[PDB]
């Protein structure tokens, strides 16, 4: 579990030269301090337990902020039920952490933090609210009103969270179609053919394996409308668990631009510094 010790070394005068190498071979010279300078025996007790993949990814990171309202459905701007597209690309921190690798395979844990506030001081009357969060896999009917039949959740998983309680939480297994999630996909979903009537038939988005990759989460307030509008927001935190990764990649160096690998704005990450300045 601990790192290897340091071996004592003495003066060297030999025909074997570990200092010289040739990076052209594509290999890293696996030297140790004892191969270039004299060293003493040191029992090593430092460990790499904090650098493991589990430890690296064992954190919950915000990925979305969903806003819903509780008001009469014909009084103001009606946005009293939302529907969020499940994706980790809405933020930058977790996306950059994940994009160190090409493929990954992990379970996931969702945690929901809900906060509410008033908007008018005329009454100040409102009772405790209950929130419904329904998962709608691709192809399932999507609600088109806050109280239509789709909310019966006959087979869709759904969470009923009462305001003021501990944050809701659930776990999801590896639900990928392939044997590992593909953070990067160098291909298309459709291929145009010479026999196609027009070019737009085979058109597709570059680096987009599928549409509706994981579905949406529908959020509403079960309570009817109080005399005053009440606004609330839902924050979603994702923690990968039991993580395996493959094929490391360089990390992102310039600001993200869209769900692809595009870059527009800055393209100048490094700062100025003299060549011979400490």
């Amino acid at each position: 579990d601990s790192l290897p010790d340091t071996k004592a070394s003495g003066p060297a005068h030999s025909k074997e030269v570990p200092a010289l190498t040739a990076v052209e071979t594509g290999a890293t010279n696996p030297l140790a301090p004892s191969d270039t300078v004299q060293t003493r025996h040191v029992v090593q007790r430092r460990s790499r337990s904090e650098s493991t993949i589990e430890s690296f990814f064992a954190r919950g990171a915000c990925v979305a902020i969903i806003e819903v309202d509780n008001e009469q459905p014909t009084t103001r701007a009606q946005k009293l039920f939302a529907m969020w597209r499940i994706t980790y690309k809405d933020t930058v921190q977790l996306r950059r952490k994940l994009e160190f690798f090409t493929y990954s395979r992990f379970d996931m844990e969702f945690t929901f933090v809900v906060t509410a506030n008033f908007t008018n001081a005329n009454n100040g009357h409102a009772l405790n609210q209950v929130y419904q969060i329904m998962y709608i896999p691709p192809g399932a009917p999507t609600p088109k009103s806050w109280d239509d039949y789709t909310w019966q959740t006959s087979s869709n998983p759904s969470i009923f969270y009462t305001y003021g309680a501990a944050p809701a939480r659930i776990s999801v297994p590896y639900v990928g179609l392939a044997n590992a999630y593909s953070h990067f996909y160098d291909g298309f979903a459709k291929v145009p053919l010479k026999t196609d009537a027009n070019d737009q038939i085979g058109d597709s988005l570059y680096s987009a394996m599928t549409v509706d990759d994981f579905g949406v989460l529908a959020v509403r307030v079960v309570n009817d409308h109080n005399p005053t509008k009440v606004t609330s927001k839902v924050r979603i935190y994702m923690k990968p668990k039991h993580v395996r990764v493959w094929c490391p990649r360089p990390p992102r160096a310039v600001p993200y631009y869209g769900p692809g690998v595009d870059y527009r704005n800055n393209l100048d990450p490094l700062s100025e510094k003299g060549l011979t300045t400490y």
Partner: antibody
Amino acid sequence: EVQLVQSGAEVKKSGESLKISCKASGYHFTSYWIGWVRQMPGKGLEWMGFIYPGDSDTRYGPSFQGQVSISADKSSSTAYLQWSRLKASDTAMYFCARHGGFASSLYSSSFRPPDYWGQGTLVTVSS
Amino acid sequence: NFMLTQPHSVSESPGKTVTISCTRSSGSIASSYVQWYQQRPGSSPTTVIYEDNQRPSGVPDRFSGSIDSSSNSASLIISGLKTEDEADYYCQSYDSSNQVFGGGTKLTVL
């Protein structure tokens, strides 16, 4: 019946302010939003605004900031489209629209488009 | 920002069948729903299709809407064309906050 009635063709000289109205029948006018759509001769339709008396959101056209304005009147169950300074490029056919309702979403799912239209109004200068 | 391209134009004869297309160019196609509007010569626009699966009052079943998620294209199929189908057809959308109209397709029936 659930219908929107506009005024017939309207004529004004260049540089003046014009105002046209769209009146609803058979229901309360301000149940939901009112949208105004323009169609220049031989071209596709275009957006002008989507307004509602709660805040009178006069969402102008990108190239017509301020020139085009919209408002609603609860007493007469009518909405009005107003131009501040007419130009030769404002010669078009204007339609007022409205959706029966059903809109409850923060996002595209149920923030709906109109399903009933007016007969349209024409803005020209006779010649 | 984005457009709703349409096919140039179609000229047919009564009893034919056509499929008018409309290709979206931005926003997730599966999120917002495309529509269709018919404007007969010298007439106001009318609503014929929206939500991708709901049809308004007074529309004969001869007109049906359909979508292709992968290609971001919406289709309108007319089976058994009629001489009274002579009109312009526009595909309309509502992405998240505003409506964007298409370029318009002219259909001719002899």
